[PDB]
């Protein structure tokens, strides 16, 4: 299991326990539920790039104690 560090806007450090097998689609939607907002409202930025639904931890280069940022999109959802 990989423990990613999600940096919240209020300095909240979220520890998302992911697995190097699942898709980031499941992760993106689950995080939205954790906050209580609809999917596509929050953009996940990794190294300046936005995490897509078909994205996988196998690509880009995700590891343990990795830093991922989450921001609210102008679309609102």
């Amino acid at each position: 299991y990989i423990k990613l560090k999600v940096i919240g806007q209020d300095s909240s450090e979220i520890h998302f326990k992911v697995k190097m097998t699942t898709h980031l689609k499941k992760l993106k939607e689950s995080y939205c539920q954790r906050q209580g907002v609809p999917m596509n409202s929050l953009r996940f930025l990794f190294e300046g790039q936005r995490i897509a639904d078909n994205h996988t931890p196998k690509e880009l280069g995700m590891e343990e104690e990795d830093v991922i940022e989450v921001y609210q999109e102008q679309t609102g959802g």
């Binding site: 909240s12 450090e13 699942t22």
Partner: peptide, 12 residues
């Protein structure tokens, strides 16, 4: 200094 743990389920 705030840590929240979330667990994800993986589809076989």
């Amino acid at each position: 200094n705030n840590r929240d743990p979330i667990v994800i389920s993986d589809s076989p």
